[PDB]
Amino acid sequence: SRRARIERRTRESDIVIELDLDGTGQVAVDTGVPFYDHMLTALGSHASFDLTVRATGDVEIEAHHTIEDTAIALGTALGQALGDKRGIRRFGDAFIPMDETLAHAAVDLSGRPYCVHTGEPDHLQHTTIAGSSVPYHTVINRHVFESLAANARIALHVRVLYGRDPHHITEAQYKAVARALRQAVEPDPR
Amino acid sequence: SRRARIERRTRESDIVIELDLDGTGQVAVDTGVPFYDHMLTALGSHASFDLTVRATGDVEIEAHHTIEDTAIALGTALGQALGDKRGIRRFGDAFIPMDETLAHAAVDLSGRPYCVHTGEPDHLQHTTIAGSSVPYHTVINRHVFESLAANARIALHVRVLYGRDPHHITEAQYKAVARALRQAVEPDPR
Amino acid sequence: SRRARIERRTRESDIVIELDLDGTGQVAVDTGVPFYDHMLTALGSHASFDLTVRATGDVEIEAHHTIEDTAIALGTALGQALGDKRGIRRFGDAFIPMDETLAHAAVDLSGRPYCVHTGEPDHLQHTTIAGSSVPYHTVINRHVFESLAANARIALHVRVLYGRDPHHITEAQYKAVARALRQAVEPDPR
Amino acid sequence: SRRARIERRTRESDIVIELDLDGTGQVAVDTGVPFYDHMLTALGSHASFDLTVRATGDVEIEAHHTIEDTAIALGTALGQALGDKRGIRRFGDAFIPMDETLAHAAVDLSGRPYCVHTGEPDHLQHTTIAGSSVPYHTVINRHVFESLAANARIALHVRVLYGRDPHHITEAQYKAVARALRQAVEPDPR
Amino acid sequence: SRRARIERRTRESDIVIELDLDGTGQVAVDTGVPFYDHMLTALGSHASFDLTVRATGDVEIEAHHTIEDTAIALGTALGQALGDKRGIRRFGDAFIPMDETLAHAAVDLSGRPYCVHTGEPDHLQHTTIAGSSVPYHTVINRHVFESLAANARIALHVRVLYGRDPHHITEAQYKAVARALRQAVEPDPR
Amino acid sequence: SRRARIERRTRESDIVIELDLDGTGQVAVDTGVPFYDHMLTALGSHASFDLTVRATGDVEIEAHHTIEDTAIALGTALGQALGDKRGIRRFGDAFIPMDETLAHAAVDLSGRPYCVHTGEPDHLQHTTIAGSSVPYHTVINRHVFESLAANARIALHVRVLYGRDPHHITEAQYKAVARALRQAVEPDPR
Numbered sequence A, B, C, D, E, F: 001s002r003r004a005r006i007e008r009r010t011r012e013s014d015i016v017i018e019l020d021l022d023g024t025g026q027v028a029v030d031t032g033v034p035f036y037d038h039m040l041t042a043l044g045s046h047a048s049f050d051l052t053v054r055a056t057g058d059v060e061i062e063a064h065h066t067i068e069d070t071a072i073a074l075g076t077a078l079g080q081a082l083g084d085k086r087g088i089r090r091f092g093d094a095f096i097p098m099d100e101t102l103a104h105a106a107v108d109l110s111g112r113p114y115c116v117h118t119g120e121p122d123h124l125q126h127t128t129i130a131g132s133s134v135p136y137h138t139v140i141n142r143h144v145f146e147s148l149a150a151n152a153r154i155a156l157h158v159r160v161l162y163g164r165d166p167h168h169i170t171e172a173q174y175k176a177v178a179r180a181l182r183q184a185v186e187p188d189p190r
């Protein structure tokens, strides 16, 4: 009923998205950026979407292009699946406590495209989350949310009330958006 | 079931309110103050009330008396429609993102009359919203919420987390109260 | 289905807790600390638990030991009643307006044990609430929440946005936790 | 071997102390000030003394006189039991973590009488610990340590590194002194 | 006598711990995070434990999950090996000088779960220790200590008095905890 | 078993040191600088060393050269007596209360040469301790500790937590080092 398939081929990347708004958390993400995969898995899961993401990009340069192209594609998919946006709750919000971190997200699905990202500690402008593969620079967090809000054409406010650990700060934000989205897309019985 | 009709004749104004708490957003507002009409329409709509407001007042002087008398009348109507307040959720809250603005409202319907209004930028103390008719002075926003809370006999906290545009700041607040009220008046299945 | 009985005998105190998560607000609390009884009644009631607390302790010394032992016991009971935590909403939050005070609580029931307590005015570090019996020192508020979060093994963030009266500040917090818990333990239809 | 019995009759109070330095924590304290009893129990226990304190005083006025007279008597007993102070470790110290509080104590048993008390938060100058009986004013903490150090004729430095709860701050200090004393009085194998 | 074996399978990781409190420093650690291995080796060695750690996790994402799961598992093992905690010294502390760095740790093994981590320079919130494999982000230091304290159910205060080098600051802390633990678990001859 | 004899002839001075780590406090010091003799006596005594120091130097110029040469020689002797440093506790620390002063010392005997000297009041940079003979300038305190740490090849941190009297500040430091050393050199039963 509320599905969307988006293919997006740029010079930097090639993306395929499959999105079902009324899913059960069946999520499979592979972008070549493992921490981004982890975040998009959290997104899909906590939003109760069925989400398949397959992305290959110029990760030798860095993750930026891949992360950004995926977010654009994902936003487009979200907007398409929403459709005319009839009979939905439209507004959604969520607080996410994650150990010492507390994040919050609020959405208006019919509201004009906008993104406000506030509260994130300053050290996230130059923090890296690194494993055995392509690393993740937390400075991209802003971009990811902006890109999604811009391409889904929704109002999205994301706040970090407080927090220390960059893994927790980042993950809390993704989960906050997921749960705000979940509430907003749900059918309204009025 | 939960209806109320209030007639209020003062020297300054004459007001009629018709309110159904369990409505479908059938709203008709005419106070002679067009921007106030726009706000009360947003209120009724987003609260899912059926609301009819008819008000005539000394708008040649200014909107103050009309806006205040309507708010008193509306609060009285809300309180009457609520009745004994049995088996309702009682507590409600809502975040409303409106472009750059984010507003929040929280209510306790059984709690003693109280109103706290915080966060509104200082320039709203001397901002006017003006069209082709009677203008609206944003300084009245406080009064409107206080008057309603006082006459409905409810606890009402309204916060502007941030914002710039006075139309957005004002509209977000009215919508926030509407959606907080909607949640609070809903029947509780416990 | 989701019940728990905890008996806890220390040198300082002897505690019995009976907890049903899926109750109707049938609450009976007797700790020998009347204001604590009032708070635990608010907790049980607003969480829609069925809660029986019976506690005797060394109240001649002060309430601390009794209040702390009860909170540990209560946390243990909450954790046990939750069980495997299958098919619940997991996340919950609540704003509680109480006259001039506004408090907020947010929980993650599956999240690792953690407690953050912020915003409480400084005078609550040396405020006493006193009647005709054992008094209550508001400095214990922190401890109570920490103890519960530690023994239920949950993430619990409690904030006072603003407030003046210590009775209101304390009561709002207890009610906020109750309603956050209520939302989190509720079955999720997904 | 290292025992002492002190009887001290003033106008304000009547005190009996029985002290064995080489005990097993057999402690019985009754001063008419329940929280002081709790602290002196912690002292005796954690020092591994055998300690019997019996005190009656003008508690209708307040605890001050009783608390001070006991501390003087106890210091005298400690000094007498120590004797010539031959073949002991002489120096002792202890850190005591108590939830959020961390306290420290350091002693020189042969060093000239001296007491330094630092780090205690300012609100302890006007904090009361109150149960169902005679209350305890944390401002006396200083006095108790000074009185003991003066009458045992020892160097005693007590520091609160950090802490919030007055019960914890007070109890940590008493336990810190106990364990510093324990180490100092122990026989030195050199 | 005081042994424990813990197996912990999560989605992120799989952990096996073998712990003997009364060991001779026979330590074998393999988590896939070499610097963490180095730290856990220092822990086991300086505590005079016999410790075997085997952990595999999603290190492609980053070390966080593995480091955290190991710490939880290790804390659980420590608590189990401690048992009823009868006839032990209970309190322990240690200063560790490491070149320019000085760190300190203090424990109460019977005290309620708590962790305070103070003094660490600000640049450790965004410092990485990197070799030829999975890197280590010093921001996790806090988490590791908190996780252990939470799962062993002990009071643990860790302080950096001063220091510059992040390798030294981190290593000193791990060694400080090890030696505080060693002293606390030792049998008390009273 | 753990002895050392060091002879050191410079242009400025001629030094003989005899050191037994496992002594009974048999100490005889003569450097021509009486206050230094007093300090080195405190060192040897409180460390439970057997120590003989005989030094003659250009004291007509000032004590500096003699004090420094002795400290170098003494450090060399300490290092030699320690030997391979097998089966010792290695780490040691001590707080020393001396009237109003509190000093602290912490050592790592196997740790790389290092000395940190902190907390000493500023007036000790230009304070003199003078009797009927060669005076002592407290500014040398730093040098003495640095010289020892450098020539014994040990980590040595010395702190003055607080203090006023320069005799007490100086003496407390020497005693603190002595007792830290005593604990570190002691055989470890593991």
Ligand SMILES: [Mn+2]
Pocket: A064, A068, A143
């Ligand atoms: Mn970009």
Ligand SMILES: [Mn+2]
Pocket: B064, B068, B143
């Ligand atoms: Mn007015």
Ligand SMILES: [Mn+2]
Pocket: B038, B167, B171
């Ligand atoms: Mn508008």
Ligand SMILES: [Mn+2]
Pocket: C065, D038, D167, D171
């Ligand atoms: Mn206590």
Ligand SMILES: [Mn+2]
Pocket: C064, C068, C143, D099, D168
């Ligand atoms: Mn406590």
Ligand SMILES: [Mn+2]
Pocket: C038, C167, C171
């Ligand atoms: Mn009340």
Ligand SMILES: [Mn+2]
Pocket: D064, D068, D143
């Ligand atoms: Mn006095």
Ligand SMILES: [Mn+2]
Pocket: A038, A167, A171, E065
């Ligand atoms: Mn994660």
Ligand SMILES: [Mn+2]
Pocket: A099, A168, E064, E068, E143
């Ligand atoms: Mn974590």
Ligand SMILES: [Mn+2]
Pocket: E038, E167, E171
């Ligand atoms: Mn190393």
Ligand SMILES: [Mn+2]
Pocket: F064, F068, F143
């Ligand atoms: Mn020199």
Ligand SMILES: [Mn+2]
Pocket: F038, F167, F171
């Ligand atoms: Mn002297």
